[PDB]
């Protein structure tokens, strides 16, 4: 397991390449494998320790990438759960609020979406144009 | 972008 901490950045990079090329399903598989590596390393660490936390933080963007792939393939249940897990630890994560909001909006949880999009707005005001758009689209279906 | 990957 430990020898594969070196593999993670390369897997991460290949997943990104696949994603941007439009191979979203294959990208998700790459992200999943990268996260699995980090989780295996994290299991050897005590929860709440510096090393556990560092790995947890290396997992976050990969897990959000994975969630982004799930949004594209219209699978919302895992996005909601993974974003919620991230946000229950790191409640300032803008990307997690945004993706969870997208997923809430896509499953007709209009109120939970608005709440998440408000948090995006609160934490990164530069995203106001996008949030306004998401909000306008929610209101349109009201 | 918010629909890109990190």
Numbering used by the authors:
A (entry chain A): 172 to 313
B (entry chain E): 1 to 6
Could you share sentences copied from the article?
The human AIP gene encodes a 37 kDa protein of 330 amino acids that, based on similarities to other proteins, is predicted to have an N-terminal immunophilin-like domain and a C-terminal tetratricopeptide repeat (TPR) domain. The TPR domain of AIP is similar to other TPR-domain proteins consisting of three pairs of anti-parallel helices and a Cα-7h. We present the structure showing the molecular interactions of the TPR domain of AIP in complex with the peptide-binding motifs of HSP90 and TOMM20. We found that the EDASRMEEVD (HSP90) and AQSLAEDDVE (TOMM20) peptides bind within the TPR-domain cleft and adopt a similar backbone conformation.
Interactions between the TOMM20 peptide and the TPR domain of AIP are similar but not identical. The main differences result due to the need to pack the first glutamate side-chain of the TOMM20 peptide (AQSLAEDDVE) into the hydrophobic pocket that accepts the methionine residue in the case of HSP90 peptide (MEEVD). While the side chain of this glutamate enters the hydrophobic pocket the carboxylate oxygens point back towards and interacts with the side-chain amine of Lys 266. Consequently, Lys 266 adopts an alternative conformation to that seen with the HSP90 bound peptide. The conformational change in Lys 266 acts like a switch that not only allows the binding of the TOMM20 glutamate in the methionine pocket, but also allows the longer C-terminal glutamate side-chain of TOMM20 (Asp in HSP90), to pack between the side chain of Pro 232 and Lys 266; and consequently form a hydrogen bond via a water molecule with the side-chain amine of Asn 264. Significantly, Arg 304, whose missense mutation is linked to disease, was found to form interactions with the aspartates of the TOMM20 peptide (AQSLAEDDVE) bound in the neighbouring TPR domain. The structure with TOMM20 peptide showed that electron density for residues Asp 172 to Arg 325 of the TPR domain was visible. Structural analysis showed that the Gln 307 and Arg 325 amino acid residues (all clearly visible in the TOMM20-AIP structure), are further away from the TPR domain-binding site than Arg 304, and are not involved in packing interactions or in binding of the bound conserved peptide motifs. Thus, the rearrangement that allows the glutamate residue of TOMM20 (EDDVE) to bind the hydrophobic pocket also allows the longer C-terminal glutamate side-chain of TOMM20 to be accommodated. * 10-mer peptides were used in the crystallization, but only 6–7 resides were visible.
